Amino acid sequence: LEPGHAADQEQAKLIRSAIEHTTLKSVTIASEIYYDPDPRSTVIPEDEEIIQLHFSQQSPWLLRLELDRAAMNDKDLTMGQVGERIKQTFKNDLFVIWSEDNDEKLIIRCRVVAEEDHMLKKIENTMLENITLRGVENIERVVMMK
Amino acid sequence: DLDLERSNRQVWLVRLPMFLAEKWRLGKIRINKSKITLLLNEPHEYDLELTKKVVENEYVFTEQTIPKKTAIVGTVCHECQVMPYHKIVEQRRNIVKLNNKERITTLDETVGVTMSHTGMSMRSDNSNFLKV
Amino acid sequence: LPHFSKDDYSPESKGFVENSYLRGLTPQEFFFHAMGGREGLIDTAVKTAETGYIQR
Amino acid sequence: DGPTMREITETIAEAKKKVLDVTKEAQANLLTAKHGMTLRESFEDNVVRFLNEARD
Amino acid sequence: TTFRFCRDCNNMLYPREDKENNRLLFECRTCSYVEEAGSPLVYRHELITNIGETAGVVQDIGSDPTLPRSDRECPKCHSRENVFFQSQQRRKDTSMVLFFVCLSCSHIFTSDQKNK
Amino acid sequence: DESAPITAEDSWAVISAFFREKGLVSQQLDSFNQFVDYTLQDIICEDSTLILEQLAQISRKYEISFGKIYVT
Amino acid sequence: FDMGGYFIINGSEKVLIAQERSAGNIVQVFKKAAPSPISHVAEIRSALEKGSRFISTLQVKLYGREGSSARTIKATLPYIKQDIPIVIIFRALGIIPDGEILEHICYDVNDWQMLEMLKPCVEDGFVIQDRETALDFIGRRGTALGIKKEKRIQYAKDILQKEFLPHITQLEGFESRKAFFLGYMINRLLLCALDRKDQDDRDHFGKKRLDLAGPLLAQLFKTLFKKLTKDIFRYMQRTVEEAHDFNMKLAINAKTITSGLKYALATGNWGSSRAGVSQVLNRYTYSSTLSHLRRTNTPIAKPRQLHNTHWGLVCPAETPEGQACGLVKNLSLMSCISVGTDPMPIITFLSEWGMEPLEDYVPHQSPDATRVFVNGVWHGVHRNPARLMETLRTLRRKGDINPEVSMIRDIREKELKIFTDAGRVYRPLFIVEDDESLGHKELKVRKGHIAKLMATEYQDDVEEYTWSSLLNEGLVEYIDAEEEESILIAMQPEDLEPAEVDPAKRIRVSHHATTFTHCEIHPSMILGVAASIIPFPDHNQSPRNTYQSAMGKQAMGVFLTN
Amino acid sequence: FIKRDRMRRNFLRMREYNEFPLRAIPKEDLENMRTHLLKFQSKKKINPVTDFHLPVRLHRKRKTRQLKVLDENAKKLRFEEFYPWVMEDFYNTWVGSYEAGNSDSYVLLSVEDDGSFTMIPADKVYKFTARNKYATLTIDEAEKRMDK
Numbered sequence A: 001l002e003p004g005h006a007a008d009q010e011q012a013k014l015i016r017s018a019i020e021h022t023t024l025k026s027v028t029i030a031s032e033i034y035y036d037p038d039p040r041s042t043v044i045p046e047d048e049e050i051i052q053l054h055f056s057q058q059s060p061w062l063l064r065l066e067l068d069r070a071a072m073n074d075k076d077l078t079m080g081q082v083g084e085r086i087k088q089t090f091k092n093d094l095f096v097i098w099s100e101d102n103d104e105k106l107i108i109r110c111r112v113v114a115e116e117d118h119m120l121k122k123i124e125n126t127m128l129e130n131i132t133l134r135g136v137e138n139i140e141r142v143v144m145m146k
Numbered sequence B: 001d002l003d004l005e006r007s008n009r010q011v012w013l014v015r016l017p018m019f020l021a022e023k024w025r026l027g028k029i030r031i032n033k034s035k036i037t038l039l040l041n042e043p044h045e046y047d048l049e050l051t052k053k054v055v056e057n058e059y060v061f062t063e064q065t066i067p068k069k070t071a072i073v074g075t076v077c078h079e080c081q082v083m084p085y086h087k088i089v090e091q092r093r094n095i096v097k098l099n100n101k102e103r104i105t106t107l108d109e110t111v112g113v114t115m116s117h118t119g120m121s122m123r124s125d126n127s128n129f130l131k132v
Numbered sequence C: 001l002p003h004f005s006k007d008d009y010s011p012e013s014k015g016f017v018e019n020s021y022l023r024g025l026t027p028q029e030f031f032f033h034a035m036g037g038r039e040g041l042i043d044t045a046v047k048t049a050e051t052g053y054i055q056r
Numbered sequence D: 001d002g003p004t005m006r007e008i009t010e011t012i013a014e015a016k017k018k019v020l021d022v023t024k025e026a027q028a029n030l031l032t033a034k035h036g037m038t039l040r041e042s043f044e045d046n047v048v049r050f051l052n053e054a055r056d
Numbered sequence E: 001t002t003f004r005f006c007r008d009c010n011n012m013l014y015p016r017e018d019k020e021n022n023r024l025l026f027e028c029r030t031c032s033y034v035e036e037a038g039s040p041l042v043y044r045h046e047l048i049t050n051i052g053e054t055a056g057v058v059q060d061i062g063s064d065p066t067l068p069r070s071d072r073e074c075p076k077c078h079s080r081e082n083v084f085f086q087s088q089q090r091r092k093d094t095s096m097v098l099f100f101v102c103l104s105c106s107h108i109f110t111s112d113q114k115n116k
Numbered sequence F: 001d002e003s004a005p006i007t008a009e010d011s012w013a014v015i016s017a018f019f020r021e022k023g024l025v026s027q028q029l030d031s032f033n034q035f036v037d038y039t040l041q042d043i044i045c046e047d048s049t050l051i052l053e054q055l056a057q058i059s060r061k062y063e064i065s066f067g068k069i070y071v072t
Numbered sequence G: 001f002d003m004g005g006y007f008i009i010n011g012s013e014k015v016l017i018a019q020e021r022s023a024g025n026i027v028q029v030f031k032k033a034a035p036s037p038i039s040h041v042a043e044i045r046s047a048l049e050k051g052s053r054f055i056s057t058l059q060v061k062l063y064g065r066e067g068s069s070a071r072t073i074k075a076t077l078p079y080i081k082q083d084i085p086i087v088i089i090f091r092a093l094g095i096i097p098d099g100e101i102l103e104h105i106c107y108d109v110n111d112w113q114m115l116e117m118l119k120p121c122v123e124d125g126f127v128i129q130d131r132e133t134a135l136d137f138i139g140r141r142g143t144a145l146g147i148k149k150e151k152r153i154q155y156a157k158d159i160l161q162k163e164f165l166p167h168i169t170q171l172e173g174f175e176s177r178k179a180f181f182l183g184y185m186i187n188r189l190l191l192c193a194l195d196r197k198d199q200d201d202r203d204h205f206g207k208k209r210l211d212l213a214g215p216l217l218a219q220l221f222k223t224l225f226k227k228l229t230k231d232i233f234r235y236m237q238r239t240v241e242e243a244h245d246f247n248m249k250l251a252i253n254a255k256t257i258t259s260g261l262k263y264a265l266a267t268g269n270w271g272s273s274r275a276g277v278s279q280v281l282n283r284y285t286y287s288s289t290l291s292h293l294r295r296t297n298t299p300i301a302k303p304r305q306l307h308n309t310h311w312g313l314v315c316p317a318e319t320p321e322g323q324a325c326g327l328v329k330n331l332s333l334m335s336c337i338s339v340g341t342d343p344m345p346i347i348t349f350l351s352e353w354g355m356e357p358l359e360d361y362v363p364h365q366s367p368d369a370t371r372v373f374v375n376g377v378w379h380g381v382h383r384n385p386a387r388l389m390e391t392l393r394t395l396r397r398k399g400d401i402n403p404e405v406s407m408i409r410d411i412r413e414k415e416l417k418i419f420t421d422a423g424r425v426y427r428p429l430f431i432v433e434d435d436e437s438l439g440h441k442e443l444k445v446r447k448g449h450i451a452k453l454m455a456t457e458y459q460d461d462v463e464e465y466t467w468s469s470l471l472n473e474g475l476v477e478y479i480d481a482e483e484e485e486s487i488l489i490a491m492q493p494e495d496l497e498p499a500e501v502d503p504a505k506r507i508r509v510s511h512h513a514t515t516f517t518h519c520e521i522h523p524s525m526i527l528g529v530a531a532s533i534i535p536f537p538d539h540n541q542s543p544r545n546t547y548q549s550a551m552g553k554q555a556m557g558v559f560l561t562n
Numbered sequence H: 001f002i003k004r005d006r007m008r009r010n011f012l013r014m015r016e017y018n019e020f021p022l023r024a025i026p027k028e029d030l031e032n033m034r035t036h037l038l039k040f041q042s043k044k045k046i047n048p049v050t051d052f053h054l055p056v057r058l059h060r061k062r063k064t065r066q067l068k069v070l071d072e073n074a075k076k077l078r079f080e081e082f083y084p085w086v087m088e089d090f091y092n093t094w095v096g097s098y099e100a101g102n103s104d105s106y107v108l109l110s111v112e113d114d115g116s117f118t119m120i121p122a123d124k125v126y127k128f129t130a131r132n133k134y135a136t137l138t139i140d141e142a143e144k145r146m147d148k
C-alpha cells in the first residue's frame, strides 16, 4: 500500500473491495422460474409488497432469484447497484425488479419483451456465470497481512 | 384362425420348491378363511401365501410369417407361492452344498510302458481314421 | 484403522504418538510411524532423482 | 526423573483437554473459520498446533 | 421440479402456455394429453445444496456396531441411548455438526446450538 | 476353569497351531495344487472339441475331443 | 528345513513372484480434472470367471462441466465407434417408456435432483422413441461390415445379448436384468455427481487381486492348449485335403506344451507383456529364502506410499530401497492368498429363503429391499437381510461355506457384496461374542479348547484337536481387506475386552468401544519375515527397521544341511 | 522378561375350512398343447381380451475341406424360433417377447366349475407389449433430424 495510508484496515478493505473478483452466482442462494402471464399483477402473495412499491407487452414468463444476505455483507453489495449492473448488461430487452435490503427475503424478478422457459434458462446461465459484480479478473481471497 | 375359448377361467400361478416341482414334472388344498394349506398324499402340508392379490394384465394361452393354431385359456386370478419334519428338508438343503469333482488320476505304472506307447512303438494302423 | 470408531476426531486416533521410544510404541502408532518412514524414503529418492537431472 | 515424567504427562494432558474443547466447539458449530480456510482446515491447524506445542 | 408423467405414454409433461385462457398447462408432445396446472412453479435450480447431509438413514441403523454410542438424552422420549453421526453430504464446506439418532423413537435431533 | 478367559501369552499357542498346519510358504503349494487338480481339467474340458468339415459330391465330418487328462 | 515352494529348470531354482492386478466386475467412478468435456467416468472391467479371458470394458460417460447446463449422459459400447446415450440403449433393451427408465435409474421418487439431471437424456430419448429404430440406430452407428440392414439389426441385437456385459450371462432374454444393472451404474454415476459419494479409491487393498502359479499357469496352459488344438486340426485338414494316411505321432505334438511351459518357467517372460516373474532363488541365508518366496511384486494415487489397508497384510517395514521402493511388498506372517471356490451353491441356497429374482423387482412395490451381490453380479434383492445374513454367517462359521469367501454388508450403501474369487489376501482373527453368561462380552475360544490343543501339541493319547477343529467350531475366522471395512478389531484380548499404573510402561487407549466383533491374534504378526528378526522394533525408528530388513537378506549363515 | 522355553516340563508335570382335491391332467392334453404365460406392459390395470375386441389374432411374424465351430441343442431350438408373435384385430397391437428366467418352477392351478383344481406345468412365459399406440416413426428422417 501507500506510505500515507499505512497501518489502516478500512482503506485496505476498500482496496480489497475494489479488486477482488465477485460474481452474481456468489450471492445466489437459489433461483426459480414462474408462469405469471399478467406483467404487472403477480400471483405470489408475498412479493405483492414488492409489486406495491417497485412499480409506482412483456413476456408471460417470470425469472426470480434469491440472494444470501450474508453474501451481501461479506461481499459488500447493494440490490440497487446489482440491478444497475444487469440493466446495463442486457440493456432494455429484460425488465428487472429487485427487493430492498430491508426485506428479510432478498428477491429479484425479471421478464422479457417457442416456450419462454428455455429462453429464461439461457439467461440464467448468463446471469450466474457471465456477470461480475465488482473487482478485476483472476483475483481471489485477498488476505490482510501485517 | 386364432379363437379365444373363454378367458373367463381363473388360474392361480404357483412358485413351488424344487424337489416337489421336479416330482410333479396328488394333494388336497384346504382353504382357511386368509390362510390356505395343502395336504399331499402319503405327505407334508404346505401354507400357500397370497403373493399378489391384484394380478391384472396377466393371462394364460396355449398353442396347438408362419401362423399357428392359437387358443386362449383363462385369466390369472391370484399370484401365489408355496411355503413349507422340516429338519430333514433343512438337512437336505445343507446337504446340497457338498458337490465335488473328481481329481486327476496319476498313472502308477513303470513309465517305460507308457513312454514306449508315446513315440515309436512298432505299432501302426489298428484304427480307421482319415485313411482315405 | 478398523480398531477405532467412526467419525473419530480425537488426536490419538488421528496420528498422535504420545508414547516415547524409551517405553515402546503401540501398534496403531508404529503403523503411522512406518508410513512416515516410507514417505521419507520415497521423498528422498525423488529429490535425488530430480537433483541429478537438475545437476546435469 | 519422576517429577519430569509427571510434568510431561500433565503437559500432554492439558493439550488433550484443549483438543477436546476445540473438538466440542467444532462439533457444536460455534467456531467460525478465518478468511482463506474452512472449518476443517482451521480445526486441524489448531489441533496440530496444540500437539506440536505440547511436544516442544 | 417434481413433474408428472403422461397417461399411457408415461412421457414427461412439458409445460405448455395457454394463450386462450392465459393459464399454464402440462402437455405430452407424443399424444394429445394435456392436463391443467396446479402451480405456477416450473423450474428450481437451488444452488447452495444443504440436503443429503442426513442421507442413508435406515430402520436398522441402531444395530450398526461400527457406529458410536452417546449418553445425551432425546428431546422427545428422553432416551439417553442413541447413535450419532455427522453429515452424509460429502463436500469441502460441510460443517461437522453431529446428528443424534435416538434408539427408541427413531428421531433425528442434531446438536447445533446456534440454529435448530 | 475350562471356561476362563485366555491371556495375551496364551495366544502364542494358537499361532503355533497355525504354522504347524499351513507352513511359511503354504500359499504357493495350495495354489499350485489346486491348479494341478482343477485347472488342468477345466482348461482341457473348456475347449477340447474340434471338428473337420469334409465336402464331397455326400457331406462328411470328423471330430476330435479331449477327455480326462492324466498327470504322472 | 527345506521349505520348497519353487521350481527347478536346467538345474536352476526358479521362483514365480506373486503378481498384482486390479479386480473386475465392479462399478467404479472417477473424476476428470482436465478441460475434457467429460466430468465423471463410470468404468467397469467386465469379464467371465473362467475361459476366454475377456478384456472388453464398459464406460458410462457424463458430459458437461459443473455449472453449465445440458449435461447429457453417453455410454460407449464395444465394437461401436461413437458413444451412444443411455436412454437409447434402454430403448434397444426393450424398455420404450421413459417413466420406467427413471424408475430403473433413480429408486427414490422423493428425490428431484437426479430426475432433474435426467431431463436432457429424456429429450434425446424423446428424439428416438422406438425400439426398432434404436436397434437400427446402433446398427447404423457402429460396425459397418453388416452392409445389409436386416442383418445389422439382428446383429446389433446379438451384440446386446452377447458382447454387451459379458458377465452375468450371454444368453438371449436377459435384457431386463442388464437394464436394471445399467440403471444401477447410472445411479452410481449421477449419485457420484451429486457430491453424495467420494471418488472410488483404487488403493484399497481389498479391490486388488494377486496371481500365483495357479492363474499364471492357467493363462499359459490355456493359450498353449488352444495352439495345440489349432495345430492338430491343421494336420487334420492337411491330411484330408492332401488325401493321405493319418498318424497320431504327427498330429499331436509335445514340444509345443513342453517348449511353452519350459520356456515360460525358464525365462522371465510369461509369453513383452510380463517380465521379471521368475527369479533365481536367493540362498544367502534362511530368512532370505523365507522373505524371498513370500515376496510379492507390483507392476509399474501414489502406489509407493504405505496405505492404511495394508494393516496385517503387507509388512510396513520390509521393503527394498532404490527405484523399486514400495513397489515390492512382503506378506505378513499370517497372511494368505485365496484360491477361489464355487458361487453356484450359494446362489442356489439364497433363492430357497425368498430371494426375489432381479427381473421381478419393482422399486415402487419394494423400496426398502436390500440388494444382493454375488461377485459383482446382481441376482436379486431380499426384504429381510437380517435373518438371511445371520443364517449365512452361522453357516459360514460351522465350516459349510469355505472360509476364504468374504462377505460384506454395507449398510449406508444398502448392499451386500459376496467375494469368492481367487487373489484376495486375508488373515485369521478371533471371534468376539457379546452374549455370555458373565454379563459382558467375551471371546468364543475358552481355556478348555486351549487345554485340548496343547494336549495334542505336546502329546505329539491324542485328541486330534488342531487348527481345523478350532475353525469348524466357530472360534477363528479369516478376514480380507474388504470385510475389514465392516468389523471392529481389538488389539490385546485381556486389555480391551474387560471393563475397568507404572510409569515405565507405554500409554494405551481406552475401552469405550463395546461392539468389538473381532480381536487381533497378536500385533507382532503384522510384520514380515525380515522384520521379525528385529529385537524390540517398537523402540526403534522405522527406517532402521527397513534397513535391517534389507540387510537380513544377505548375511552369512547356514541355509540348509545338504 | 525372558522367553519361557521349559514348557515341556511344565506341561508334562501338569497333564370355516373347505378341502378340495388336486389332480394331474393326463399327459395327452400336455402333448397336444403347450401352456405359455401372458404379461402385459401398458401400465393400464384392466386391459382384458374382451375389451381387446375381435377378431383376435396371435400369429408369429468353391471351398475345399474347411472348419466348423459347434453348438448345442435347446439353445439352437430357441435360436431358430426368433420370430415373435403378435395379437391384433383387423386397431390394437401386442407384441410379446421371451422371458426365459421366469421358467424355473411355475405350476398352474386352473379352477374348474367344482372346488377342485387342475395343475399344469408351465412351459414358457412371455411379456407382451402394447405396440404402436401413438403411430409415428421416420428412420432416415430421424437420422437427419438428430443432426441439428
Ligand SMILES: [Zn+2]
Pocket (backbone or CB within 6 Å): E006, E007, E008, E009, E010, E011, E028, E029, E030, E031, E032, E033
Ligand atoms: Zn402421452
Ligand SMILES: [Zn+2]
Pocket (backbone or CB within 6 Å): E074, E075, E076, E077, E078, E079, E102, E103, E104, E105, E106, E107
Ligand atoms: Zn428419541
